Design a protein around this motif. Structure first.
Motif, short mmCIF file in Angstrom:
data_model
loop_
_atom_site.label_atom_id
_atom_site.label_comp_id
_atom_site.label_asym_id
_atom_site.label_seq_id
_atom_site.Cartn_x
_atom_site.Cartn_y
_atom_site.Cartn_z
N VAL A 179 36.23 0.39 -34.44
CA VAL A 179 37.68 0.59 -34.65
C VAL A 179 38.38 -0.53 -33.87
CG1 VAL A 179 39.76 1.97 -34.44
CG2 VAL A 179 37.64 3.03 -35.14
N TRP A 180 39.20 -1.28 -34.56
CA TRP A 180 39.92 -2.40 -33.96
C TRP A 180 41.40 -2.07 -33.87
CZ3 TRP A 180 40.14 -6.29 -30.90
CH2 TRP A 180 41.07 -7.37 -31.05
N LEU A 181 42.02 -2.27 -32.70
CA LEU A 181 43.49 -2.00 -32.50
C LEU A 181 44.13 -3.39 -32.28
CD1 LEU A 181 43.05 0.99 -30.01
CD2 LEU A 181 43.48 1.01 -32.39
N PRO A 182 44.56 -4.04 -33.37
CA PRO A 182 45.07 -5.38 -33.28
C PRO A 182 46.20 -5.61 -32.30
CG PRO A 182 45.47 -4.42 -35.47
CD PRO A 182 44.53 -3.48 -34.74
N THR A 183 47.11 -4.64 -32.16
CA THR A 183 48.25 -4.77 -31.28
C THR A 183 47.86 -4.70 -29.81
OG1 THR A 183 48.92 -2.38 -31.28
CG2 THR A 183 49.87 -3.75 -33.00
N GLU A 184 46.68 -4.15 -29.49
CA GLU A 184 46.27 -4.02 -28.08
C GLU A 184 45.06 -4.88 -27.75
OE1 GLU A 184 48.11 -1.17 -26.81
OE2 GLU A 184 49.02 -1.68 -28.80
N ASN A 185 44.48 -5.54 -28.75
CA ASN A 185 43.26 -6.32 -28.63
C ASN A 185 42.17 -5.47 -27.98
OD1 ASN A 185 45.40 -8.77 -28.09
ND2 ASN A 185 43.73 -9.11 -29.57
N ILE A 186 42.09 -4.22 -28.39
CA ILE A 186 41.03 -3.33 -27.88
C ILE A 186 40.08 -2.95 -29.04
CG2 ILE A 186 40.54 -1.02 -26.96
CD1 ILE A 186 43.32 -1.30 -25.52
N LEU A 187 38.79 -3.09 -28.86
CA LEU A 187 37.77 -2.74 -29.80
C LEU A 187 36.93 -1.53 -29.28
CD1 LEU A 187 35.97 -3.64 -32.37
CD2 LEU A 187 34.59 -4.87 -30.79
N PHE A 188 36.93 -0.48 -30.08
CA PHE A 188 36.07 0.69 -29.76
C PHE A 188 34.79 0.45 -30.57
CE2 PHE A 188 34.90 5.46 -30.26
CZ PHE A 188 34.25 5.52 -29.01
N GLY A 189 33.77 -0.06 -29.93
CA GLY A 189 32.52 -0.35 -30.62
C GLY A 189 31.65 0.88 -30.77
N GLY A 190 31.79 1.88 -29.86
CA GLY A 190 30.94 3.07 -30.09
C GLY A 190 29.54 2.85 -29.62
N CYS A 191 28.56 3.64 -30.07
CA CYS A 191 27.19 3.64 -29.68
C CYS A 191 26.33 2.51 -30.17
CB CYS A 191 26.49 4.98 -29.96
SG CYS A 191 27.50 6.39 -29.30
N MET A 192 26.84 1.67 -31.09
CA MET A 192 26.07 0.48 -31.46
C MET A 192 26.08 -0.53 -30.28
SD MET A 192 28.21 -2.14 -33.97
CE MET A 192 28.76 -0.81 -35.02
N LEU A 193 26.93 -0.29 -29.24
CA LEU A 193 26.95 -1.14 -28.07
C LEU A 193 26.44 -0.40 -26.83
CD1 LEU A 193 30.59 -2.62 -28.40
CD2 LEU A 193 28.48 -3.63 -29.17
N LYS A 194 25.67 -1.06 -26.00
CA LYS A 194 25.18 -0.49 -24.74
C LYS A 194 26.04 -1.07 -23.59
CE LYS A 194 21.96 1.71 -26.77
NZ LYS A 194 21.77 3.16 -26.61
N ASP A 195 26.31 -0.28 -22.53
CA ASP A 195 27.12 -0.82 -21.45
C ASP A 195 26.28 -1.75 -20.58
OD1 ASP A 195 25.74 1.27 -20.21
OD2 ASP A 195 27.16 1.25 -18.55
N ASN A 196 26.90 -2.46 -19.61
CA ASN A 196 26.23 -3.47 -18.81
C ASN A 196 25.21 -2.96 -17.81
OD1 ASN A 196 27.62 -5.75 -20.04
ND2 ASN A 196 29.38 -5.40 -18.72
N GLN A 197 25.20 -1.66 -17.52
CA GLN A 197 24.23 -1.08 -16.59
C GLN A 197 23.02 -0.49 -17.32
OE1 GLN A 197 26.77 1.93 -14.39
NE2 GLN A 197 26.24 0.87 -12.54
N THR A 198 23.07 -0.43 -18.64
CA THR A 198 22.05 0.11 -19.52
C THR A 198 21.02 -0.96 -19.79
OG1 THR A 198 23.47 1.72 -20.53
CG2 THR A 198 21.61 1.16 -21.87
#
Ligand code: NA
Ligand code: NA
Ligand SMILES: [Zn+2]
Ligand SMILES: [Zn+2]
Ligand SMILES: [Zn+2]
Ligand SMILES: [Zn+2]
Lengths: 227, 227
Positions: free
Chosen positions: B149-168
């Motif tokens: 989900v891309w929010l163009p006005t806030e430049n925020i991307l909700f990638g969800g579970c296809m992405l792992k966080d940096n501690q994973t």
């Protein structure tokens, strides 16, 4: 350069011309970099050669739209090999108009590949909303149907695979080449576009007109020693 | 970060977007943090993913109404797993409208789960009273139906579970994954949203675009090591 993805990078040569490199691992050859060009005028773009497949082509076209704010409307392949028309299937469904050497069209039809719809036998100027792309067929070389595209307003020539980059020392793949016409074609390429500032080959780094002499040395030394 | 309950915390990312972390003990997995987002515009709110069950979804919807003074009208799940649609039954008795990849709806019907009403096949822009929420399906990954989900006005991307966080460090649950497509989907996400400032994974801390390269590294090392 700008790495748009893992296998594709783009370099701007002029305000309207960009050159791309697409990477693909091909069995028997290794990791091969294949080059093309992106030409833009008034929000319209022309692609000269596609990457090896539809997937990489679709990624490249999406980038031109989103980052270059232009729509691809025109396509010209250098010759019938995969590093020139590998992604033509995707562009044809999209309604992109294609122009190519009638010899390329006859080869594609014979072989079961996507076929460009507009052909030419000696030369043809394609207009990208007024900006001219000048296509010439000057004789055989790396492939029997290989052409060159001159951009007179930018002084950039896309020589394609009939030219080797400066790091390349071998004649390479000559399974569809006309080795005896090659040196002659290079001499015609040398006489016709003496003012090119940038000359882009089919594979490897772009350079200037020295790539023409460099290629001629490789072809001639091979002809001399295998003869 | 502010805790609104013992098991839910909220972080404000912009004046219109908040991301939440909801903790639940999942038998066989342990204490799992699941992330979602709340987007607010003109007293209307969209929820991106719900907590694992209805009771935590209710606690969160109450907070949005009483502290944000907004009515939740819209919902979009990242895929069909419990940490995306676990509280959908509660939202649907409340009249919230749901939008999801058509593949997620088809999987929900087949797996006897609550079913979203509006489906889309490649992309869809859901307007939250004027503010665009851009949904895209760019290929399989952690799940075959996962979207971003891309929010163009806030430049925020909700990638969800296809992405792992940096501690994973591990690829995690791949029971419904499309491992061969995952690295390519990631390159497409990366190429399409070069201006993303915050990137939020389905579990763990949010960060920037490095989450994309790090997850591509984890997936590629697993494919390489297991062939
Ligand atoms: Na090429
Ligand atoms: Na979630
Ligand atoms: Zn060739
Ligand atoms: Zn070539
Ligand atoms: Zn999942
Ligand atoms: Zn998950």
């Amino acid at each position: 350069s700008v790495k748009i993805s893992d296998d594709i990078s783009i370099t701007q040569l002029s305000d309207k011309v960009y050159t791309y490199v697409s990477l693909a691992e091909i069995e028997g050859w290794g990791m091969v970099p294949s080059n093309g060009m992106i030409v833009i005028n008034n929000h319209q773009a022309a692609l000269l050669d596609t990457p090896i497949n539809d997937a990489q082509t679709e990624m490249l076209v999406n980038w031109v739209t989103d980052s270059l704010h232009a729509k691809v409307t025109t396509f010209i392949p250098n010759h019938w090999h995969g590093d020139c028309i590998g992604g033509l299937g995707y562009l044809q469904r999209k309604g992109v108009q294609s122009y190519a050497n009638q010899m390329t069209i006859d080869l594609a039809k014979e072989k079961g590949l996507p076929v460009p719809e507009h052909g030419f036998t000696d030369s043809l100027t394609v207009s990208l909303d007024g900006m001219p792309l000048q296509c010439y067929y000057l004789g055989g070389g790396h492939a029997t149907d290989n052409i060159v595209v001159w951009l007179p307003t930018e002084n950039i020539l896309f020589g394609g695979c009939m030219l080797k980059d400066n790091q390349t020392t071998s004649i390479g793949n000559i399974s569809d080449a006309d080795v005896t016409a090659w040196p002659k074609t290079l001499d015609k390429v040398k006489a016709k576009f003496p003012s090119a500032r940038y000359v882009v080959p089919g594979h490897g780094n772009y350079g200037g007109t020295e790539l023409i002499e460099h290629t001629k040395q490789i072809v001639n030394q091979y002809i001399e020693s295998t003869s």
